[model samples]
Target chain A: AGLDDREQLASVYELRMELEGGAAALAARRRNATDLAAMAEALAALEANLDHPEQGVEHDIAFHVAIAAATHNRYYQDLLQYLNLQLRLAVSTARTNSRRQEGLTAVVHQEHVAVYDAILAGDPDRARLAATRHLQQAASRLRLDL
Target chain B: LDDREQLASVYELRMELEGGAAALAARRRNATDLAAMAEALAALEANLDHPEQGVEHDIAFHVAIAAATHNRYYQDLLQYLNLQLRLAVSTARTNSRRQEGLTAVVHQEHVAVYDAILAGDPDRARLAATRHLQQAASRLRLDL
Candidate 1:
């Protein structure tokens, strides 16, 4: 069952990579919209709660979900919801792991800021790359190579 | 709790999660995932004569697609959603199994989703998934 679980995770990561292009493009289109602001606010909330894993995890998930919602596609929203529990676990684990390394928190913050900045700049390719890099880093913190 | 309420909730969640998952699966599936999907289809076909067992296989088939997306998020969501589905399986199974030609239609829809994913066409996969869910909801007499 555990092997099966890991295999599924790998597949999910692959799916995310495939969809990131479309998702970033859609998010870029809505760069000036309230939805993007809400996503940035979610990221801000996460930054404030960085020392609080539980709250931080919630905000992290919220930030990602907000981006999905900004895509203006209910399918993306539903996909995010479908992945919600695992994402919460992943975010929590990633935060815990990052806390163990000195200066890593700043690095993580920078990575997230890169994503937000690209989306705000309406650069779909950059946003997609940033988002992918963020996920890859998160997975690495979890000791899973995607 | 009213059985109808449970059924409704399960139906809606299933449609949303499974449909999106299928689309992602189509875009990201690899050889191993495709093989798993084929096995799931076989399982579903084998259990069609037994409606209760068939429903279980049906859930498994969708889960396979969810897993194929290689996104743990969809996998987690589908697993969570699958629990709710089990709650209404008895009610849904009886209604669906009693309908003439419904079993064949259900099988065909599953095949459609499987084929679309194998073709690596996300749009077609999404359409197939939505069609499957809509038919399933209709069979359950749920509007949506």
Candidate 2:
């Protein structure tokens, strides 16, 4: 089709939760201390700024990126771009609509902690579960409905 | 220990002995690798602009790079990148219709990755690649 004939396409966040599925989590278990420390720092940053949506949102992306980076897979790193974008829009929308709830932040923080602990302990299954649950809750909080 | 030939020998040994032929073959034809390569090609053929093409190349390039690592697990990641690229292309097409600045964002990411690769800075490459993808994705209105 010609560029002029091009029509609009559907929007999707294909890089979300699916990217961090079991395989990626398996790589996380073999991560070095540097990766774990970066993840920890990102989590702490998120915790420190939970009430501040902007900071929380930024830190959240950082945390997730850190986790993906552990695999040393550039593709995983690239996958984070779309995921973070979705996260920022969801949080920003919530913030703008004044629908910012405490439970949302708390749930995210709790999941972050669980993910951190699991990754640090080299528990791939638990890390995957924690991250998945956190992402699910994030979608719910954002009202994205999947 | 510092000799380049020694390093090459080690890598060759790794290819030959570590996991052997089965491992190498699996890495070559893994599900993720095929999917990622296909996604990259699709993204490129989407007829996006120069910058958007860069993002497409970014996704595709990384898929190829991951394949070189010979890590079967990395193949799973190829699918995820492919999915994101699809969404990104959708957003880019929208922005094109509206005459938005999304392409510019993608271009910036392209420059970052290209520079990092040229400089042989793997960490910088990773950082640039990550930031570029995230920023471009944000513009697409795609939220979790």
Candidate 3:
């Protein structure tokens, strides 16, 4: 709720939460090897830069975008465009800020792994569940009432 | 994975996308936009006895609300989505028409959405629109 207008931020966040789950499910059923590569590479890029919020969030955003690409539907891709970079910047900054530890960065990365593993297994139902859980905690992490 | 399965997926996305658009429309609507929405809803109600025509007005009302947001992507994307689900929407309205009291219920749902928007209440608009779509899905025999 640190954003100037938290209501607007919540709206965007809800939209993204819905899209992330839907897209991950579609990707599970539709992704190609190339699509999987993009996801894996993005995760790799993100894993190495946890301390650098700027670079860290770029890959984090790309990781989700890559999942959108995996859906093989231009509609889902443009759907991601609706969640603007401005929100992601603010969100990721909130994420990377130093906080009391419970594997702070490590746990977040594991959430991404949960999504990736489900997609890799071609399990649409699992992919959707994993993505939804990950996004919900991301919201919780930011102290968003939504 | 199959055509039938994807329909559920599409419906899920439609609910969220339309819900978001409704919220934004509540935030951004002007007098002209409200007038358009009112016109579209009236047209929808007037044609309820004719499933095919009612479907047209039903969709027009949805499109009109999307435009009320002043976000081109919402309108443009919804237009594209309609192309993909033309037959499904037609069938849903046709089914509702066949069942007694169903179309009336549907109209009331639409009115509820309009009332929320009229009140300039974004959260209520989203909830109202989401409720409308979920009921519409059930009418269509969609498990979503």
Candidate 4:
């Protein structure tokens, strides 16, 4: 972890982690049914592009953005958008690394499903927990510490 | 209410979130975070006479403080706020440079925030953060 790049990567990681809380709160509210639908669509897209790392990364970003949008907080949307470029690169790198392992793609899919299910179930704690686990697992798969 | 511009709202939100973040950082900062803050402070000092460079260093200083909080939410919020700070910081620095001793006063305020964090005094860190932001806004003719 160098100074400039290390801090930049850390910033991206932090944003990725913090988004879970907002997503969980919005999912718990169950106010924006459309967002849930969009998330589901993004999940389907990710699965469809599992072999295509580039496309999968885009879908992954979409899924997270949809969850943030559900919160109806412009601040979340703005931050996510501002971080989009770097986030895309980071997500692409992680997904590429994860796909190299046996059955890891399916495991990643299941992790996302868990998050989607928790949201659909309107379980805030479970939703938050699922999201956190997903990110932690992703980081681990990417060989990142915390 | 009529005075509310987009940048004005951005400044207020940044001040509120960053002030809270400074307090959290003071309470939770680890050795690594503290070291980062020290480096950022040094950078600020190095760039004091270069307005453009100073603005960048100043923003970096704030970002380092946010990261010190050890909370991803604060980091994300600060990054978003920083996106709008470039122009605001430039204008604020220019205004402060026009007055004698103003730059030194601003530098002292930043040091106060850094010292409070180093001392693990959350309240003092927050107060210093608010004062720093308030003065910055004032220099820009922005009311928060």
How well is each residue in A1-146 modelled by candidate 4, as lDDT tens digits? 33235455555564466455545555656537798889899999988876766678888888888877775555556767876776776777788888788778878988888888888887878887888788878877765674
Q: On residues B73-141, what C-alpha lDDT tens digit does candidate 3 reach at each position?
A: 567568877865565567677778788888889899999888888899999998999898788877766
Indicate the worst ten consecutive residues by lDDT in candidate 2 chain A. A2-11
Candidate 1: tens digits of C-alpha lDDT, residues A1-146? 44236555555555455454346656876655788788889878867876655667787778877777777655567767766665655667678888888878768888878878888888878887888888777677766765
**Which sections of candidate 2 miss by over 4 Å?**
A1-14, A22-24, A82-84, A94-99, B1-144
Best by lDDT: 3
* Candidate 2 residue pairs in backbone clash: A81-B133, A81-B134, A86-B142, A86-B143, B32-B75
Residue-wise C-alpha lDDT for candidate 4, range B44-112, written one tens digit per residue: 787666655888888888889988888665765666566677766776777788998788888888899
The number of clashing residue pairs in model 1 is 11
For each candidate, the DockQ is: 0.13, 0.05, 0.19, 0.13
**Model 1 chain B weakest lDDT span, ten residues long:** B1-10
Error of 4 at B22 (Å): 6.6
Deviation (Å) of A46 in candidate 4: 1.5
Show the colliding residue pairs in model 4: none
- TM-score of each candidate? 0.55, 0.45, 0.63, 0.58
Distance from true location, Cα of A105 in model 4, Å: 0.8
User: What is the lDDT, from 0 to 100, of the residue B83 in candidate 1?
Assistant: 61
Docking class of 2: incorrect
lDDT of 2 by residue, A80-128 (tens): 5644544466445544333255456666677778877888788778877
